[PDB]
């Protein structure tokens, strides 16, 4: 183990890294969907992003350490083009030293008596904070951080002797981390600073489940539910199987559940769409050069034709969203739930190896990879799914709030935009039904207690997001919040069990580990699906 | 239609006896690895010149499998990826050319063309301006540069083309295509000067390949797709298979056929 | 807006087959019989790509292995025709029919050779026999007409008219005949050509054929400028194995 | 040995001959320079020609034997196209039988007494004679023939016992010939009948020195003579050598001697021409399809530039004629002598073998060859050399007479015709001189005794060609002609010897074997060349 700054090894670029930088820059500047110019404005931003990778919390580096290298911040494009990585390695070695200073100061602080009876607060988001000007200012910031870390552990029932044991372990480990950092970790972080300024799905990479069916029965009526986990190769076949099976059961309507259904295979979105409509295009795919491909299901056998609801949430991403958008745009299915993720783009990997590397530089290692965006998705009506995602016809109460998840929140996400509509024939309309579906939905959820509680949690989450990043360092204030949190949860559970004829819990920890939350959104979608069945029949 | 037309070019007896000879030599095992990759390169150049680009790509890939550090080979594979519309991979190939040999000038032309068709006009202009400075009296260097600059700023492209002509020695025939582009001569005068300069069918065919392509591009940028289409097919009709203008007349037609 | 195709380019299939054929011929996986067969097949492919010298090489090699392939002499005869050595071409076709007197296309090709060789009555003998073997093939009537035009212009036209009237009138080529007969104008011919073409390859083919017969029509009227342009426009289609492509080239050679 | 008709083997077509006929017909009807149609008119002529091959003298076959097969004379084209050769072999076997009849009759007539006192005549040309109607008529014709053969030998000093010994040998040999004739001889003669109807240089074929220079001197004047035997590959190089050597001497003029110079390489005519003229085309060659190739010498260098005479005769053929015509048409040399042969065409051989014959019919023999005309020559002025040949500027006396030899006398020789003149620049003119050269020539040869005798022989030959084919069967009339022939020759020789200071001959057989006739034509051409030399240095502009 390790007791002083000068025993942290000084990290240096490996002989291949200049070349790898040139190759990465070549790919990103020439082939990326986003057509950015690696000019001086862009170089500065790569620079700022690199600093935030070295010091997320703005409590390790000094403003004078930063201004030293910020003079030449606009030159980073050149540096990257010509494989000069001095700025990246110089800052990284300085950051390692500054980090060891912080951890060793933190170890010293731990011995001091802890007092959590203040009205002080801790900011969890320092990403917009001025850089600290000197050691005193760093030291105040780490007094505050160590107090947060201490109090964090106190609120989980640990003793002062045990807080100091844990944090000693943690801070000593963070120091052993510094010595075990290598050249590739530095290079990697420099290419990440470039990558992520282009878009949030672009990256540099250092070198080295089936469909479920159930039937819900409300009154005398029956609804089939297809629980789809992913758009896996083969899905569309397993769904045929299940649809013929529901036919035998004579179901009034069908729900397709694409909640938390992310990524996946685009072919499967196209072919799955095929099962419910017969037309051409499902999706339009645009490359990095204005060229548009239209993808079609050309075996126009419809296997369903009955009332259809698509159930989606904020985590429905990519293939999911294409399928849901097709069904919406064709007027084939009602979409219910939350606005989806808005993942409207596709990335691809590319090796940085060249076939003559081994021959001309036998001493090099293998070289790793880039991932970059190449295609954007558009709907048949012209609009992209990028950002806006799919907006449901009936939005559950959770959807009528701005969320902290989704492409629209990610850093430098590409914008929404549109192209011309494709040629297509709508299979239904369904806008007729919308005002009665919404009136009956709104009637039912005013009286359902799960929904009533969700409304309450939403009102409360909204009055608290004001101060979301500001945490109290007063142990009493924080215990009282933890206890009202546990008591609310307990009451929520007990309200449920009294309704169900199940025994009340005495305390929250007596709850089984395997306890399944109910699914109000799915339950209410069954009701929505049956409403649709009535209105479609006459 | 009394156009200017050549007899479309045919394989010469020499090109065909050399290919026959090349097949026999490759079928022998009399060859160093260096010599074999060199011969595969040479046979690829010949097959490309006859318009057999898949046979060419095959000999080129085989060459790199024997020696992977031939920049001359990557240059052709980059060209082919350009004609195939795979601009992304074409950029990779040209980068490879210039990594092996940064003095390999024609990679700047070809990467320029690739970046032009790939809708990266500023980057294309960088490569084509560098290709220009390496031989400013070669008019075709000014022409490709102009094609790229036209997308940034039409008025300023034209001004830079005018300057490139005024600086030049005005000797090479291609300056007449430039003169047309600049408004200084009419289409008929261009064609008159083309026939005057051509001496035999091969030189006529070549002049027509070049000239119909630039005429084609001129009309395309005016929105006249019927005239552009005809002109591109007339360029290709000359069978000057290894001209860049032949290759991109084909590509331009492929993009008119898709639309 | 005249009527032009994109000049035809080698297809990927034709080029991978050639590459495959080279490997097989280099290998020792072939009988003598199999080798002569493959050399024939590679000749046919190279001819279809317009590599006639490489074709002749593979054809000569085939005959060296087996000297009784009528299919090979037929191509050698064609090549001797394009080279203007009519005399030797006759020998090659005689050889075709001596090996296999039912090898009909030798009658066409010997007829064409005799036509270019200025033996119009003898050409007519071969081409009339080629006609009788498939009278609804309009191109058979067209080559017969070309030979008879040199004997008697007015009677050639009459026999062509009869050949049309007796035919089923199905195949597109009858439209070139209709033009030859005066029944339609050049613009109508072109109109029907575009209507009948479905894609670039069929357009190119139609233009190869049609520009050659238009070329010949104008040449026989003395319009060398129009003939010259038309022959070059036929050739521009790169339909290398059409007889009409081969003799558009030969006609151009004679105008030089 | 052989005593009766039925021991003559009946000849039959071999298994390959049908094929060979098809192949021959294919070449001749498709590729010959002459574009004939093998129709019924042509078939009849092939038939007539075949009869004359079987019976040249029209004294073997009967008119009834001929009419038997003449009904189907127009079918011979079909027969040839499809390899049916029944008419050819039937007539050939009938001809063999009829021939044996004639020879056996001749053996019998021979023993009868000979009387050569009759004033009867014998016609040597029966080629347009009516076919004999019967055996009596045949027998009278062979009485006549055997009398000719007998008298022929008597006039060489043989006795009656020796004439009968010889003619017995000869007629018995002609019978042994018949039995030794084979199928290929028949086939061959049938294809010859086809061939030679097309033109006289076309044929079916069954399967199987340097230039010399001297110098002549008249007064103090000198003339160099290049005696060219043939247009051999290499000639043009050997002639440079000789022209440098003549320069080292100082000759007033040069004679090129192309007498009896036939055939040869065309390239050599072109390149030889080059030595005397600057540039341009020498000859235009036309193929079987109206296409015209122009052959030129493209060296540029003239190696002579001085007065030049080309000496030619009736036997100057083909390459020779091209060279002389070029020199004439360019105004470069004076041509002297006789109108040339008129060989204006080129022939080529082709094998009738095919590469698959050995494999598919292993038991066949090898198959032989055809020769046919493919090209005709034209001069730079447009006219062909075919037939008219080259007409000299000064014609020696034997040239102002129609001769028996030359293309214009050959059977079915293609006609003369012309094409457009080629583009060329005349290097001189020489037309002015023509009437003074001729006046001086005519003065000199009125006084030369060789020339005086040539004109005498021409007058006598010309008054004799009336009955040229009609020979007398009177021994005394024929001895008297042989004796006036020998006496004229003896006097000729003795006139020469008296002039030369040489001893007179007493009789003609005392003359040495190695005796060289003089060369008056060459001597007089030396005089012509010197005349040219004066008139050329006397020219101001």
């Amino acid at each position: 183990d390790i007791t002083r700054a000068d025993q942290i090894p000084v990290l240096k670029e490996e002989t291949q890294h200049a070349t790898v930088s040139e190759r990465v820059t070549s790919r990103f500047t020439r082939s990326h969907y986003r057509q950015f110019d690696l000019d001086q404005a862009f170089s500065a931003k790569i620079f700022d992003r690199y600093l935030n990778l070295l010091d997320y919390s703005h409590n390790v580096l000094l403003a004078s350490d930063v201004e030293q290298f910020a003079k030449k911040k606009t030159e980073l494009g050149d540096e990257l083009r010509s494989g000069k990585l001095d700025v990246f390695y110089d800052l990284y070695n300085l950051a390692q030293k500054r980090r060891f200073e912080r951890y060793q100061y933190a170890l010293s602080v731990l011995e001091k008596p802890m007092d959590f009876t203040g009205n002080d607060t801790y900011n969890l988001d320092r990403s917009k904070a001025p850089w600290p000007k000197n050691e005193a200012e760093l030291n105040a910031l780490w007094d505050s951080k160590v107090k947060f870390d201490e109090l964090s552990l106190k609120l989980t029932g640990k003793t002062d002797k045990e807080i100091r044991e844990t944090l000693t372990r943690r801070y000593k480990f963070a120091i052993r981390r510094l010595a075990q950092t290598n050249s590739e970790d530095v290079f990697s972080l420099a290419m990440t600073a470039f990558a992520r300024e282009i878009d949030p799905h672009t990256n540099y990479l250092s070198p080295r489940r089936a469909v479920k069916m159930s039937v819900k029965t409300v009154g005398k009526e029956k609804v089939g539910v297809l629980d789809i986990p992913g758009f896996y190769v083969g899905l569309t076949d397993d769904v045929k199987v299940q649809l013929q099976k529901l036919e035998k059961q004579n179901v009034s309507s069908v729900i397709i559940d694409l909640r938390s259904n992310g990524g996946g295979a685009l072919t499967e979105a196209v072919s799955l769409s095929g099962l419910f409509i017969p037309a051409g295009p499902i999706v339009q795919v645009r490359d990095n050069n204005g060229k548009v491909r239209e993808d079609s299901d050309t075996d126009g056998q419809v296997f369903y034709k009955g009332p259809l609801v698509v159930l989606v949430d904020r985590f429905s991403a990519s293939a999911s969203e294409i399928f849901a958008a097709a069904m919406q745009d064709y007027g084939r299915a009602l979409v219910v739930g939350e606005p989806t993720f808005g993942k409207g783009t596709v990335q691809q990997y590319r090796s940085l190896n060249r076939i003559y590397d081994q021959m001309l530089r036998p001493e090099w290692p293998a070289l790793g990879s880039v991932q970059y965006t190449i295609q954007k998705f558009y709907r048949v009506n012209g609009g992209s799914t990028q950002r806006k995602g799919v907006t449901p016809d009936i939005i559950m109460p959770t959807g009528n709030e701005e969320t902290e998840t989704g492409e629209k929140f990610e850093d430098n996400a590409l914008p929404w935009d549109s192209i011309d509509a494709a040629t297509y024939v709508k299979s239904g309309d369904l806008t007729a039904f919308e005002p009665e579906l919404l009136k009956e939905h709104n009637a039912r959820i005013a009286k359902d207690p799960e929904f009533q509680n969700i409304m309450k949690d939403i009102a409360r989450f909204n009055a608290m997001k004001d101060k979301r990043n500001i945490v109290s360092l007063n142990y009493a204030v924080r215990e009282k919040e933890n206890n009202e949190d546990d008591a609310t949860r307990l009451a929520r559970l007990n309200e449920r069990f009294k309704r169900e004829g199940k025994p009340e819990l005495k305390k929250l920890d007596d709850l089984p580990k395997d306890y399944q939350e109910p699914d109000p959104y799915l339950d209410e979608t069954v009701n929505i699906a049956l409403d649709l069945a009535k209105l479609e029949k006459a | 239609k009394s156009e200017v037309l050549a007899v479309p070019l045919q394989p010469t007896l020499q090109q065909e006896v050399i290919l026959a000879r090349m097949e026999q030599i490759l079928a022998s095992r009399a060859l160093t690895d260096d010599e074999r990759a060199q011969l595969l390169y040479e046979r690829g150049v010949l097959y490309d010149s006859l318009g057999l680009r898949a046979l060419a790509r095959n000999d080129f890939s085989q060459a790199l499998a024997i020696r992977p550090d031939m920049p001359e080979v990557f240059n052709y594979l980059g060209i082919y990826l350009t004609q195939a519309g795979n601009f992304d991979a074409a950029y990779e190939a040209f980068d490879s050319v210039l990594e092996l040999d940064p003095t390999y000038n024609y990679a700047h032309l070809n990467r320029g063309i690739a970046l032009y068709y790939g809708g990266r006009d500023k980057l294309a202009q960088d490569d084509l301006l560098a290709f220009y400075q390496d031989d400013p009296n070669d008019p075709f260097r000014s022409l490709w540069l102009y094609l790229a600059e036209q997308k940034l700023d039409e008025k300023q492209a034209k001004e830079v083309l005018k300057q490139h002509f005024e600086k030049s020695d005005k000797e090479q025939w291609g300056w007449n295509i430039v003169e047309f582009y600049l408004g200084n001569i009419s289409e008929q005068t261009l064609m008159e000067r083309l026939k005057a300069d051509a001496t035999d069918n091969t030189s006529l065919a070549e002049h027509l390949s070049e000239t119909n392509f630039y005429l084609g591009k001129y009309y395309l940028s005016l929105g006249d797709l019927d005239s552009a289409t005809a002109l591109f097919k007339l360029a290709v009709a000359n069978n000057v298979h290894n001209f860049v203008e032949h290759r991109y007349a084909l590509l331009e037609l492929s993009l008119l056929g898709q639309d």
Side-chain angles (χ1 to χ4, degrees), chain A, chain B:
Chain A
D1 83 350
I2 168 159
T3 68
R4 340 183 216 108
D6 63 2
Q7 303 169 139
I8 301 156
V10 164
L11 297 172
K12 205 179 139 214
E13 76 182 24
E14 301 172 350
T15 60
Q16 75 280 10
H17 283 133
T19 291
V20 183
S21 178
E22 295 199 14
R23 293 187 185 174
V24 161
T25 300
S26 196
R27 292 288 197 182
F28 292 166
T29 53
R30 299 176 197 307
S31 295
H32 198 279
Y33 182 95
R34 184 192 177 191
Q35 187 156 349
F36 66 99
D37 183 5
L38 177 61
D39 56 5
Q40 294 188 327
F42 202 86
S43 299
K45 297 192 150 133
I46 293 167
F47 180 82
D48 295 342
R49 178 172 301 272
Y50 186 62
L51 291 179
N52 289 338
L53 290 173
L54 283 175
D55 192 0
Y56 179 61
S57 293
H58 283 211
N59 68 8
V60 173
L61 299 184
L62 300 176
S64 60
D65 300 337
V66 155
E67 287 151 48
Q68 184 183 339
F69 294 95
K71 277 188 310 258
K72 284 160 102 90
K73 74 201 313 215
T74 65
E75 274 152 67
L76 222 53
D78 286 329
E79 297 272 69
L80 287 167
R81 278 187 290 269
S82 48
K84 303 210 192 53
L85 308 161
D86 295 318
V87 161
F88 300 110
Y89 279 77
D90 289 342
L91 276 162
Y92 199 97
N93 286 309
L94 179 61
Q96 292 240 103
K97 199 173 77 184
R98 284 284 178 269
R99 210 169 275 286
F100 170 94
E101 282 151 10
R102 291 308 93 213
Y103 280 118
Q104 217 203 36
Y105 179 74
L107 291 170
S108 84
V109 166
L110 274 184
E111 322 156 32
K112 304 182 187 141
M114 335 185 188
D115 163 35
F116 309 102
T117 70
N119 71 92
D120 37 335
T121 69
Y122 191 72
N123 192 357
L124 293 153
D125 182 29
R126 291 184 40 78
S127 71
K128 275 304 238 313
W131 298 100
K133 318 275 223 173
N134 55 73
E135 176 145 308
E137 215 172 280
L138 288 179
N139 284 358
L141 291 167
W142 283 66
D143 295 335
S144 196
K145 187 190 218 285
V146 176
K147 213 200 198 193
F148 174 90
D149 293 3
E150 286 170 333
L151 175 59
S152 211
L153 284 163
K154 191 192 174 77
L155 286 160
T156 80
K158 309 189 77 78
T159 73
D160 299 10
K161 142 233 146 90
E162 285 165 46
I163 292 163
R164 295 188 176 98
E165 269 178 45
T166 300
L167 290 186
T168 291
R169 171 54 24 233
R170 185 182 305 171
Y171 301 148
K172 282 183 188 297
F173 189 62
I175 291 175
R176 203 172 310 100
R177 267 292 298 118
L178 303 191
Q180 286 171 16
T181 305
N182 59 46
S183 186
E184 188 51 37
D185 299 319
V186 182
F187 184 73
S188 179
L189 200 83
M191 297 303 107
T192 302
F194 190 177
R196 294 300 189 87
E197 190 51 38
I198 308 158
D199 83 16
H201 310 289
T202 301
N203 291 297
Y204 166 78
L205 272 79
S206 299
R208 77 178 318 98
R209 192 258 21 213
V211 195
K212 309 294 203 74
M213 187 235 76
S214 64
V215 175
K216 307 303 161 54
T217 308
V218 169
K220 325 260 123 214
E221 298 296 1
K222 316 183 57 150
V223 176
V225 178
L226 293 172
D227 182 26
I228 306 197
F231 279 71
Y232 60 88
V233 174
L235 168 72
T236 310
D237 303 332
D238 302 344
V239 174
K240 292 166 200 183
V241 174
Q242 292 319 111
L243 283 161
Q244 59 206 32
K245 278 214 237 154
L246 280 130
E247 196 268 341
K248 288 320 287 251
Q249 218 116 340
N250 285 100
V251 88
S252 211
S253 63
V254 172
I255 300 174
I256 304 192
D257 193 346
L258 304 182
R259 287 177 297 163
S260 291
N261 216 289
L266 175 66
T267 54
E268 289 293 341
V270 166
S271 60
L272 185 72
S273 302
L275 305 199
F276 308 101
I277 79 194
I282 297 312
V283 67
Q284 325 194 241
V285 180
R286 183 179 184 167
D287 65 19
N288 58 18
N289 197 32
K291 307 220 183 127
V292 185
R293 192 195 72 206
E294 184 176 280
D295 288 1
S296 283
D297 182 72
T298 61
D299 315 353
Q301 210 203 322
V302 173
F303 298 38
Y304 180 37
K305 228 152 193 138
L308 187 61
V309 176
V310 183
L311 171 67
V312 296
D313 69 8
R314 68 180 74 157
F315 289 118
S316 296
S318 191
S320 293
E321 302 184 86
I322 293 316
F323 167 84
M327 298 304 97
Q328 188 168 70
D329 291 346
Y330 274 79
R332 179 61 185 79
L334 189 67
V335 177
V336 177
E338 291 169 338
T340 64
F341 195 94
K343 183 60 184 294
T345 68
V346 195
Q347 288 75 229
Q348 107 180 331
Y349 301 85
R350 272 312 185 234
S351 171
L352 293 157
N353 292 307
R354 288 185 182 156
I355 52 154
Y356 53 73
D357 286 344
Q358 299 244 53
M359 192 207 126
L360 288 183
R361 334 266 164 178
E363 353 59 272
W364 276 11
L367 305 181
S369 279
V370 286
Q371 175 181 55
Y372 62 98
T373 305
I374 58 161
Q375 291 172 325
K376 195 165 181 186
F377 289 150
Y378 299 82
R379 297 164 74 143
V380 303
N381 66 29
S384 181
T385 47
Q386 177 70 2
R387 267 186 195 254
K388 300 199 178 159
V390 174
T391 301
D393 299 297
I394 287 101
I395 303 193
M396 298 290 184
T398 7
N400 289 125
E401 312 282 305
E402 197 52 281
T403 179
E404 157 276 21
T405 118
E407 185 76 358
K408 71 214 289 134
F409 300 118
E410 292 271 341
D411 185 7
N412 274 357
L414 303 183
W416 174 89
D417 71 348
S418 77
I419 60 174
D420 306 334
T423 295
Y424 67 100
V425 280
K426 297 192 67 210
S427 83
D429 196 288
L430 275 55
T431 323
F433 307 149
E434 180 289 334
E436 218 194 321
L437 295 170
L438 178 67
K439 195 197 78 250
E440 300 292 278
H441 166 77
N442 277 331
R444 285 192 306 260
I445 73 164
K447 269 102 67 63
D448 191 271
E450 299 304 340
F451 281 99
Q452 274 317 132
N453 286 329
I454 295 155
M455 307 309 186
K456 287 200 199 109
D457 282 340
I458 286 161
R460 156 179 165 88
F461 177 90
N462 286 354
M464 302 302 84
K465 66 171 139 69
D466 196 36
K467 318 263 79 218
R468 171 88 156 288
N469 290 147
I470 317 314
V471 170
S472 173
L473 280 309
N474 190 265
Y475 165 84
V477 159
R478 290 272 307 288
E479 263 296 325
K480 177 144 174 71
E481 190 194 28
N482 286 355
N483 294 338
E484 284 151 25
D485 275 356
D486 291 351
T488 287
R489 175 60 183 171
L490 184 55
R492 198 134 307 181
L493 280 170
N494 276 337
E495 131 177 56
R496 224 178 254 163
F497 298 170
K498 178 186 275 178
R499 141 72 217 174
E500 290 173 6
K502 185 176 159 153
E504 313 283 8
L505 287 175
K506 285 165 168 58
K507 45 169 216 287
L508 193 51
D509 336 47
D510 299 338
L511 185 67
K513 242 72 204 184
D514 70 346
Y515 174 73
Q516 290 175 271
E517 291 307 299
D519 196 351
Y521 278 19
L522 175 52
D523 294 332
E524 169 51 26
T525 303
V526 164
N527 299 344
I528 291 168
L530 289 173
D531 275 4
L532 187 73
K534 307 285 288 188
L535 297 183
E536 262 228 65
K537 207 46 266 190
Chain B
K1 302 122 41 218
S2 167
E3 274 286 7
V4 185
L5 301 169
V7 183
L9 295 194
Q10 297 300 310
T12 66
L13 188 58
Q14 263 301 104
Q15 289 181 292
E16 294 194 79
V17 302
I18 292 159
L19 261 177
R21 187 72 218 128
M22 281 171 177
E23 189 198 4
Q24 287 157 36
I25 292 165
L26 292 159
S28 101
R29 324 300 298 162
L31 294 177
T32 60
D33 287 327
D34 287 347
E35 275 160 352
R36 184 174 288 285
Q38 180 52 33
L39 190 56
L40 287 162
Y41 174 64
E42 284 174 74
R43 187 165 78 169
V45 170
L46 181 50
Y47 269 139
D48 183 78
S49 79
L50 298 164
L52 292 160
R53 291 162 232 117
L55 287 161
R57 197 211 256 313
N58 215 75
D59 285 348
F60 296 147
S61 308
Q62 267 306 317
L64 284 173
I66 299 169
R67 15 178 335 198
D69 63 330
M70 305 173 77
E72 55 274 33
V73 178
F74 283 90
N75 179 54
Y76 275 90
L77 292 182
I79 294 168
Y80 293 156
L81 288 157
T82 306
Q83 300 176 240
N86 188 359
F87 307 118
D88 274 24
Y91 310 146
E92 181 58 23
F94 295 122
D95 269 34
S96 302
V97 177
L98 292 171
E99 182 171 71
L100 295 169
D101 186 357
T103 76
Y104 209 98
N105 288 126
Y106 268 78
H108 287 286
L109 180 57
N110 291 319
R111 193 175 52 211
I113 289 167
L115 286 164
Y116 169 73
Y117 281 108
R120 289 298 179 123
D121 294 300
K122 197 229 231 301
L123 291 166
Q125 165 191 48
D126 287 322
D127 271 326
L128 294 164
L129 193 45
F131 194 67
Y132 164 80
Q133 276 141 12
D134 179 62
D135 197 355
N137 295 316
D138 178 357
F140 297 96
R141 303 189 186 211
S142 305
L143 283 171
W144 276 100
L145 181 60
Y146 165 79
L147 292 172
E149 291 180 339
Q150 169 165 296
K151 304 261 190 198
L152 303 171
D153 186 1
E154 168 61 282
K155 177 270 306 277
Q156 199 172 27
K158 198 160 161 123
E159 179 51 34
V160 183
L161 184 63
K162 164 131 270 145
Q163 284 161 25
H164 285 340
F165 175 56
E166 297 316 333
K167 272 189 62 209
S168 83
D169 66 16
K170 297 155 130 91
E171 298 240 59
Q172 281 155 252
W173 188 80
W175 292 111
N176 295 300
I177 292 156
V178 175
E179 282 215 88
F180 170 78
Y181 266 37
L182 292 172
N184 306 346
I185 65 172
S186 64
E187 189 170 329
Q188 199 191 281
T189 305
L190 176 61
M191 294 291 102
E192 261 147 32
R193 296 185 186 179
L194 192 155
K195 288 180 282 197
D197 195 73
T199 45
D200 65 358
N201 193 71
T202 294
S203 51
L204 183 64
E206 285 172 357
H207 277 328
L208 290 174
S209 194
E210 277 162 6
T211 293
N212 288 318
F213 169 77
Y214 295 104
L215 292 175
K217 291 286 289 160
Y218 173 89
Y219 283 88
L220 184 67
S221 79
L222 297 178
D224 191 349
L225 307 196
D226 295 353
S227 299
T229 297
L231 281 158
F232 288 143
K233 290 165 178 177
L234 286 165
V236 175
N238 296 103
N239 288 336
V240 189
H241 299 284
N242 50 15
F243 274 19
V244 93
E245 296 92 355
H246 176 97
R247 299 176 200 290
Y248 307 117
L250 278 165
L251 202 206
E252 292 283 3
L253 285 162
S254 189
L255 306 173
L256 295 152
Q258 275 158 40
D259 270 341

